[PDB]
């Protein structure tokens, strides 16, 4: 994350971190339920074999209940395109259930319409991860959370340098040094509505990190609901 707040106790309980063999964070995820994690399809191409950690806010001082889990099956999206980051979205079925405790709970899945209408028209949205604090920097031990405002789609497509397919939507700022970054991809993007957060995005990509004239590109979860729904029925 680039310039944001810290996730205090119990605020980002739906965060998940995909760890590599050397036990380093390298992508984010979102707890959809006790057996399912939602991440970005392209994250699966950054590690030979990984695991998914949960309930962790400090990657140095062993806190209360951080649990590690092993992947039973990986369900990438048929249409995931490498070169255009299109259809960036996956799902992981864990071998052992997840026990919900402080710092470890699931974010809600909304219904497309209502979501894209109410949820997606709110002002800001929350994104979090253990990714780099800023472009050319080092990852980050603490888990952060930024309140990124939704971006106009037309003003979004114009700022880009690459096609913004239907499975995407910008979010962030024009110049204010605040945005997602390396190591956040796959991370959760949630929208708050009456003290209840909803999955509304997946840290997909961006051009640099918090650059002027650029925004953070997130995967449009509402366009994949029915797909995510099927996936959580194993297939």
């Amino acid at each position: 994350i680039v310039g944001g707040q810290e996730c205090k106790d119990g605020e980002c309980p739906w965060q998940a971190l995909l760890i590599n063999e050397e036990n380093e964070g390298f992508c984010g995820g979102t707890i959809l339920s006790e057996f399912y994690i939602l991440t970005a399809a392209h994250c699966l191409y950054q590690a030979k074999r990984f695991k998914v950690r949960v309930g962790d806010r400090n990657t140095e001082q062993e806190e209360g209940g951080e649990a590690v889990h092993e992947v039973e099956v990986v369900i990438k999206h048929n249409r995931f395109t490498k070169e255009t980051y299109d259809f960036d979205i996956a799902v992981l079925r864990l071998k052992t259930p997840i026990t919900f405790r402080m710092n470890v709970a699931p974010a809600c899945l909304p219904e497309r319409d209502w979501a894209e209408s109410t949820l997606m028209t709110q002002k800001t949205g929350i994104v979090s991860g253990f990714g780099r604090t800023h472009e050319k920097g080092r990852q980050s031990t603490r888990l952060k959370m930024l309140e990124v405002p939704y971006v106009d789609r037309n003003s979004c497509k114009l700022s880009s340098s690459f096609i913004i397919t239907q499975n995407m939507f910008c979010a962030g700022y024009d110049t204010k040094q605040e945005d997602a970054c390396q190591g956040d991809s796959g991370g959760p993007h949630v929208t708050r509505f009456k003290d209840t957060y909803f999955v509304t995005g997946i840290v997909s990509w961006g051009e640099g990190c918090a650059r002027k004239g650029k925004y953070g590109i997130y995967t449009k979860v509402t366009a994949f609901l029915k797909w995510i729904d099927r996936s959580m029925k194993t297939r």
Partner: protein, 51 residues
């Protein structure tokens, strides 16, 4: 009627599934008896920051 006025006065999902407003909740929540409020059924519902 009108999920536009103020989400139909629903705690969550709002639809005009007829001639009026119809509320519904996410999985793991039961629509209260006032057709609008969402009541958690389990000990750790989705959407809620752990406290």
């Amino acid at each position: 009627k009108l999920c536009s006025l103020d989400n139909g006065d629903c705690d969550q999902f709002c639809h005009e599934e007829q001639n009026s407003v119809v509320c519904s909740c996410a999985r793991g929540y039961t629509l209260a008896d006032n057709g609008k409020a969402c009541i958690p059924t389990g000990p750790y519902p989705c959407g809620k920051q752990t406290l």
